Amino acid sequence: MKKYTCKICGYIYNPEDGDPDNGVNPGTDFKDIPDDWVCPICGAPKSEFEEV
Ligand SMILES: [Zn+2]
């Protein structure tokens, strides 16, 4: 699985780390994150993300 980054702020979603505080377990491929999840830094939607 690949890392994704927020086009707005530069946050990196690392699938090996997930975002567990917001319910995204380690091992979650970006496509599988629930589509109401937002960037934990700037609040951007998934649609603003891209592969590193
Ligand atoms: Zn962001």
Numbering used by the authors: 1 to 52
Quote what the paper states about this structure.
Chimeric hybrids derived from the rubredoxins of Pyrococcus furiosus (Pf) and Clostridium pasteurianum (Cp) provide a robust system for the characterization of protein conformational stability and dynamics in a differential mode. A structure design algorithm was applied to the rubredoxins from Pyrococcus furiosus and the mesophilic bacterium Clostridium pasteurianum (Cp) to generate chimeric proteins in which the predicted hybridization interface can preserve each of the interactions in the parental structures. Interchange of the seven nonconserved residues in the metal binding site region between the Cp and Pf A2K rubredoxins yields two complementary hybrid proteins that are accurately represented as a sum of segments from the parental structures. These "cut-and-paste" models match the ultra-high resolution X-ray models to within the structural variability exhibited by the crystallographically nonequivalent molecules in the unit cell.
The coordinates for residues 1–6, 12–38 and 51–54 from Cp rubredoxin were combined with those of residues 7–11 and 39–50 from the Pf protein, to yield the metal binding site-swapped Cp hybrid. The metal binding site-swapped Cp rubredoxin crystallized in a P21 space group with three protein molecules per asymmetric unit, as earlier observed for a V44A variant of Cp rubredoxin. Refinement was extended to higher resolution with inclusion of heavy atom anisotropic temperature factors and all hydrogen atoms, to attain a final R (Rfree) factor of 11.2% (12.5%) for all reflections out to 0.79 Å. The rmsd values for the backbones of the A, B and C monomers with respect to the original search model were only 0.22 Å, 0.24 Å and 0.27 Å, respectively. Molecules A (green) and B (blue) are appreciably more similar to one another than is either of these structures to Molecule C (black). Molecule C diverges most notably from the other three molecules at residues Pro 45, Lys 46 and Ser 47, for which all backbone and sidechain heavy atoms differ by at least 0.5 Å from the superposition with any of the other molecules. Note that the direct interaction between the Lys 46 and Asp 35 sidechains that was predicted in the NMR analysis is indeed observed in the crystal structure. A clear difference between the NMR and X-ray structures occurs at the Glu 50 sidechain, for which the χ1 dihedral angle is 175° in the NMR-derived structure but near +60° in the X-ray structures, despite the fact that the 4.9 Å charge interaction with the Lys 7 sidechain is preserved in both cases. The metal binding site-swapped Cp rubredoxin analysis at 0.79 Å represents the highest resolution Zn2+-form protein structure reported to date. Given the marked similarity in Zn2+ and Fe2+ binding site geometries observed for Cp rubredoxin, the present structure may offer a useful model for the reduced active site as well.
